[model samples]
Target: MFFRLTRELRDELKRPLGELVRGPIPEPYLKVRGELEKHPVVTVGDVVTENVLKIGVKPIIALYDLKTKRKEYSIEDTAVFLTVTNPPGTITKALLDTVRKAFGLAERGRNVHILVSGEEDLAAIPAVLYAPLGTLVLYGQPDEGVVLIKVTPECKRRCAKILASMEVVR
Candidate 1:
């Protein structure tokens, strides 16, 4: 579960690959919330995770790096908090392990939090890989709305390939 992408792959891993919902996230969360109870919902990014909190639904695993788009983001203190040290571009072992455990705990009907000390963008790759079939992983797309991803076989294959393209680091 603990895998690290080399820092050199920054350009290779940045960008949106899922269906982009235009406009604000009201309708997007509305759609994403419709299946929250039935599916494993993983959210990455401070705003997305915070918005999920506002929607009165907790995602399976909520990851917040405490910053959004390279700027500071505010997230109120929570009941439980977990931390991982991952740099901006690469995924670290600790990062992937926390996400895997977060998924496992979430699958057991427990709400979990992943507070990354560094950037949380690329962790979406591992989050998708560790998620169950039909799991929906959501992340902010900056100027665009949330990127809604329904985890499928093809999605997993694509994510794995993306990881493969990135060099691993110790």
Candidate 2:
């Protein structure tokens, strides 16, 4: 099962759901290290995930599809790699399940990286949905920079609403 994006929902997501860091990669995040240290982080894109690691901040759970801008991208392997499939413009059940599993492992003090078979663009939604409050979910903003979404009730509700708007395919 999967959830396909609707036209209206696509437009809605154009607006960033979190604080956009438009400066150099990972530097902005490093400046806020004091605050960042308090919460568990969840990164949703390959570049941002790598950048976060550069800053010495390890996301409790990270998701990457091995491609950036439709080109192959690579990162050093981590101990736990959970693979899932999620095509563009859709969120697969496999993806969501893996996200949940990642969080579960994260809580047990394991660092997890979810390796996506297809596009992981929409994985942030499931990350936000499954993340506990105060968790930071970071994703790339294409030509711009990284977006750091703090998992709060408001953001979770917004993601949940977006999920509700999708057309479910079995």
Candidate 3:
């Protein structure tokens, strides 16, 4: 069910608007939160969401799978929940639509929660593009820690560059 990344576009999202960390984050996305102010926070993956919640920072939106590094993961639920499938490497229409829905909820000051039956690796991109400018999108990087992306017109344009190279799936 994974959508294949367009070959030439693979290199597009390689840059993060922030640096990468390797172990547990500073708590409540500890290191990045202060800099984030009150921007809507969107988190992807079970571990990152769990970590964010533990520190009492309720993400406006959170996305997760039941697994991490191919093992079972348990996350606490404190927000609205919805589900979508995104395969392994590719983003699907379902994923984008749900992201849109989640964004809508955030705008209305409600919590938006998401469960990705498949991987949520690339989920951050859609959040970055569709979320309002200055929204904060956080996601895991496997063995690495979370990545914080602040959405802006430039980030959206950057995401468009990669998405343009993708072959959409239903």
Candidate 4:
């Protein structure tokens, strides 16, 4: 089964899920330098993942589509690369399963980079849900900036609510 966002909820989801950092690349990442060392990091966009690594903070799991705004934006990381298909505006079972697998590997101290064939925008939801408590889930906000979400019970609940509100398809 998969989940699709309703058109009406699109506007509401536009709000940043966490702290939205604007401005330069790696510099904004410096803000989380101290806390990042104490928790896992999960990135859900090509630009976000790239900039975080630029700051020398390697995420436990990163989901990237090799594109930014539909344009090519490739990044390299020394991680176990895995690919999955998830179309835009929807979350597939494949994506959810891959997220679970990625977190499992991360728990074992393995770095994993998910190469999404379609899109990774909505993958942040599953990433936040599967990430361990205190994990930092980062994702880009298009031309805006990067959002830094610290995974907690409250945060997980919020994401779960949004996920549940989506239209499920078999």
Instruction: Tell me each candidate's TM-score.
Output: 0.81, 0.88, 0.80, 0.88
lDDT of 3 by residue, 90-143 (tens): 888888899999888777777877878878878887888788888778877655
Q: Quote the positional error of residue 94 for candidate 3 in Å.
A: 0.7
Which 10 consecutive residues of model 3 have the lowest summed lDDT?
A: 70-79
The all-Cα superposition gives candidate 3 an RMSD in Å to the true structure of 4.1
**Per-candidate RMSD, Å:** 4.5, 3.4, 4.1, 3.4
lDDT of 4 by residue, 16-45 (tens): 989987756666678777777788898888
Ranked candidates, highest lDDT first:
4, 2, 1, 3
Off by over 4 Å in 4: 66-78
Write candidate 2's Cα lDDT for 13-111 as tens digits: 887789987767656667656666888998888888777777778788878875444332343343477888788899998998999999888877888
Q: What TM-score does candidate 3 reach?
A: 0.80
Highest-lDDT candidate: 4
Better of 2 and 3 by TM-score: 2
Of models 1 and 2, which has the larger TM-score?
A: 2
Which one wins by TM-score: 3 or 4? 4
Collision pairs in model 2 = none
Q: CA lDDT, every prediction?
A: 0.76, 0.82, 0.73, 0.83
Single out the weakest 10-residue window by summed lDDT for candidate 4. Answer: 69-78
| Shift in Å, residue 3, candidate 3 | 5.8
Q: Give the TM-score of candidate 4.
A: 0.88
Deviating ranges (above 4 Å) for candidate 1: 1-14, 25-27, 35-38, 66-79
